[PDB]
Amino acid sequence: PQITLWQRPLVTIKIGGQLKEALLDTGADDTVLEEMSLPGRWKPKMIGGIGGFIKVRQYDQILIEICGHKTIGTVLVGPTPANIIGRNLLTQIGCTLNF
Amino acid sequence: PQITLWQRPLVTIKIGGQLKEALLDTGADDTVLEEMSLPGRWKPKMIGGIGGFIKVRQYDQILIEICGHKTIGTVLVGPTPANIIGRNLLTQIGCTLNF
Numbered sequence: 001p002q003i004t005l006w007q008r009p010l011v012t013i014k015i016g017g018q019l020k021e022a023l024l025d026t027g028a029d030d031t032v033l034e035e036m037s038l039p040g041r042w043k044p045k046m047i048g049g050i051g052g053f054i055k056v057r058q059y060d061q062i063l064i065e066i067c068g069h070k071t072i073g074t075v076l077v078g079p080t081p082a083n084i085i086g087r088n089l090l091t092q093i094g095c096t097l098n099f
Numbered sequence: 100p101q102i103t104l105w106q107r108p109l110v111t112i113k114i115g116g117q118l119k120e121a122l123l124d125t126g127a128d129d130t131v132l133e134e135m136s137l138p139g140r141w142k143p144k145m146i147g148g149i150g151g152f153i154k155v156r157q158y159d160q161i162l163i164e165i166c167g168h169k170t171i172g173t174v175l176v177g178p179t180p181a182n183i184i185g186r187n188l189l190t191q192i193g194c195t196l197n198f
């Protein structure tokens with residue numbers, strides 16, 4: 001798809017049998033999702049966004065199907081105001097920014 | 100330009116006659132820059148991000164040059180860790196996301 005930015009770039013993802021809407025975020029290095037029951041061993045980690053830090057659980061080699069494309073990567077789960085898809089997965093779908 | 104996401108999508112901007120580097124951020128509704136010296140009136144405003152909220156000052160009608168293109172918009176100035184170009188200026192340079 002081609003997506004213009006008059007509105008938030010939101011897309012449907014499927015993670016761990018669950019359906020979610022997430023934001024295509026080119027300013028996000030990492031992918032971070034609201035708290036969810038994701039299976040496996042995760043590792044605690046702190047991340048910094050515009051207003052300070054949040055502790056997250058780091059889960060590796062997780063399958064995420066984004067707008068239909070299957071991607072595998074590291075997903076952080078924590079208290080975030082929004083489900084963000086960052087650069088670690090955007091590179092996988094071959095997403096480019098154009099102007 | 101075509102920009103891939105293997106790296107942070109950074110661009111050079113000129114504002115209030117100072118040269119700065121900023122992130123193309125599709126996940127941000129707004130534009131927000133580190134603490135700088137800008138002329139005119141402003142208004143206190145709190146924004147919400149990951150980690151919590153920050154107090155910024157809003158300036159409207161501010162000229163900005165993005166990767167050598169002109170735009171006029173609202174700019175929020177605060178203690179952001181990074182200079183962020185959000186969807187309010189991105190729609191102006193005609194930027195889109197492709198995948």
Ligand SMILES: CC(C)(C)OC(=O)N[C@@H](Cc1ccccc1)[C@H](O)CNC[C@@H](O)[C@H](Cc1ccccc1)NC(=O)OC(C)(C)C
Binds near residue numbers: 027030124
């Ligand atoms: C998630 C993380 C891996 C921590 O990356 C960032 O937070 N990256 C920042 C750049 C940055 C890096 C390091 C430290 C500080 C800032 C971008 O603004 C990320 N895009 C912004 C988007 O995630 C966020 C989505 C959102 C939606 C609803 C509520 C809160 C937040 N919008 C966002 O923060 O927008 C404003 C800047 C306008 C507050």
